[PDB]
Symmetry: C3
Subunit: 257 residues, 3 copies
């Protein structure tokens, strides 16, 4: 079979047609799995959870477990995972809490490496890479294309901007703006992620605008509001700069300087 007979499938679970589930894995009550998704051996899936299409989940992962957050109380919170995602060895993904969104969400095309953690109520976009042991504490929003190097730690409620980059062992306590590169414990702003922008084919005009934007924010001594005003123009001209400006505007715990 596509479904190993040593696996355990709750009667209430709903598996699309070509789903593979390896030996000694558990697909629990109210778990929904979508077409082309391959579940490895030794995998614990718990619900209520919805996993889309063409995903890949490796051994020793715990996807859809209750958060150990002391506030959570057995409520029927959820987890939503999209399509084309890779979940590697021993990754842990917890479901949401009623105190927030009552949902934890992961989009599409994400690569989530071994022993990474995705805490309750987290929101991961698309095309993100979480390298080994990257941990998102809770209520963490990671926007499209971000890359978090191994053992990057993200404090609860922090937002990780689109196309951003973290060096290995970074400890992020504040919001990381879109395109920014951070390193260290505590994490510190270094520059922008030009390598990402290039691997992605951003235009030279956008890069140049991104580069001036950085200065306005980090190098000219403005308070954040002074900064946001000065970017109005370029944010009106360049969408890339608007994403940047927006990411700074939505910061609740401040920005990583």
């Amino acid at each position: 079979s596509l479904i190993d007979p040593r696996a355990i499938i709750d009667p209430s679970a709903r598996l699309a047609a070509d789903v593979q589930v390896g030996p000694w894995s558990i697909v629990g009550a109210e778990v929904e799995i979508g077409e082309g998704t391959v579940i490895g051996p030794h995998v614990v899936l718990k619900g209520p959870t919805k996993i889309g299409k063409h995903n890949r989940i490796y051994q020793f992962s715990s996807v859809g477990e209750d958060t150990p957050d002391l506030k959570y109380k057995g409520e029927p919170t959820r987890l939503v995972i999209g399509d084309h995602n890779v979940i590697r060895e021993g990754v842990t993904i917890h479901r949401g809490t009623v105190q927030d969104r009552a949902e934890t969400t992961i989009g599409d095309h994400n690569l989530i490496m071994a022993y990474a953690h995705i805490g309750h109520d987290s929101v991961i976009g698309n095309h993100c890479i979480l390298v080994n042991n990257t941990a998102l504490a809770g209520h963490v929003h990671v926007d499209d294309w971000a890359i978090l190097s191994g053992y990057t730690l993200v404090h609860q409620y922090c937002r990780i901007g689109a196309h951003s980059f973290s060096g290995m062992g970074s400890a992020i306590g504040k919001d990381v703006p879109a395109y920014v590169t951070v390193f260290g414990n505590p994490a510190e702003a270094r520059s922008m992620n030009f390598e990402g922008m290039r691997r992605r084919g951003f235009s030279s005009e956008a890069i140049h605008a991104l580069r001036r934007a950085y200065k306005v924010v980090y190098r000219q001594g403005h308070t954040v509001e002074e900064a946001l005003a000065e970017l109005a123009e370029s944010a009106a001209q360049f969408p890339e700069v608007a994403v940047f400006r927006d990411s700074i505007q939505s910061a609740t715990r401040g920005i990583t300087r």
Copy 2:
């Protein structure tokens, strides 16, 4: 209650209402108390005593031998109390013959995914060890302390009651009670006022703790001096007494 795909050793002892999920191993000389819930894919090894109403999650290794190229299999122990939560992939090692010969965990502790509790460590009650917190060995964690994600604790260190580490802290020296530490290497920052409030500490006790911080950290005093200077406040406030005592017992220095 006890899944037939699990392997229960004949010398293992299970109290009533114990559950054991599939493909778990409850080895020789493991004793499990009443109400305890063990997940699937758990390895319990002994000699080990687990109390009541505990919950242990999948991929955990509880009661394993401390690593070594050597296969020295002494009868050292692990003792775990009641109402503890042990999450995914937690490693907990038994003690060493040279030392206490026992690793000890109290009650109402929360030990999050992939934390490690090294041989001969002692955890009290109401402690939280957030993800990937690692206790090297011979570590003593007193009541209500909180170690944030990826906190590393060097061997022989004492983590004081009600203390707090920020995420990714590397602790190489005793953390006095109530103290908050950050960084690698870890440094003292302030007192855990957030914790003290959540636990209903009196405003009087909190101000006295705040003042005691300065006596130890910001007035240039020696310790024999700080402690002499603390003696009176300690007598009035049992909370200050815990603090003073944590500092007095700091044999190989305090995190400054």
Copy 3:
């Protein structure tokens, strides 16, 4: 010896006294040598060669494909020697065609829980990787090196023989032989005199190495100047020659 709940692919090759615990998978093209003990809940994938008298603990993934977006299904290898101990949850990945197409590990290595050995890394002999030590890829670790818990090693770096890293070190450049490093980012501190004594080095060799360290790290020389200055004691002392050679081979920077 081979538990009937384990899964052994027809193509695997196992030595006579190989033990395999329950719920382990020995996949296609895996070879296991005499006296090796595979625990329960182990995933082994190939092509992989495992030598003799090894110990692989539970929840380990040995011989998986690297998640490197560059790897594309090719049949790269992993070779592991003898007398190794691989603890709980260790991940070891096979090589890439972009490099050596092989991940390699020698003999007498102690690889502790949740450590990661990335694609194309090479490990020598008598090394100790403490809990959650992670080699990113294309890392070379030379004999007798000790990496303390949560040591991160950046891809392409070389860890020299008898070197030591403090816990939570983040290593981005090569670490010369014998050198001790600490912190994030990692920095050189002194020489692993423990290791030298522990390993029967003569007091004459030790003084020369101590002298060698001063030459490279304390006198304001350039690497080339420093290398030249060492030639003599390198000729006289093979221990020093290991030190000089590690610095020489430091293509892209030594840790300072």
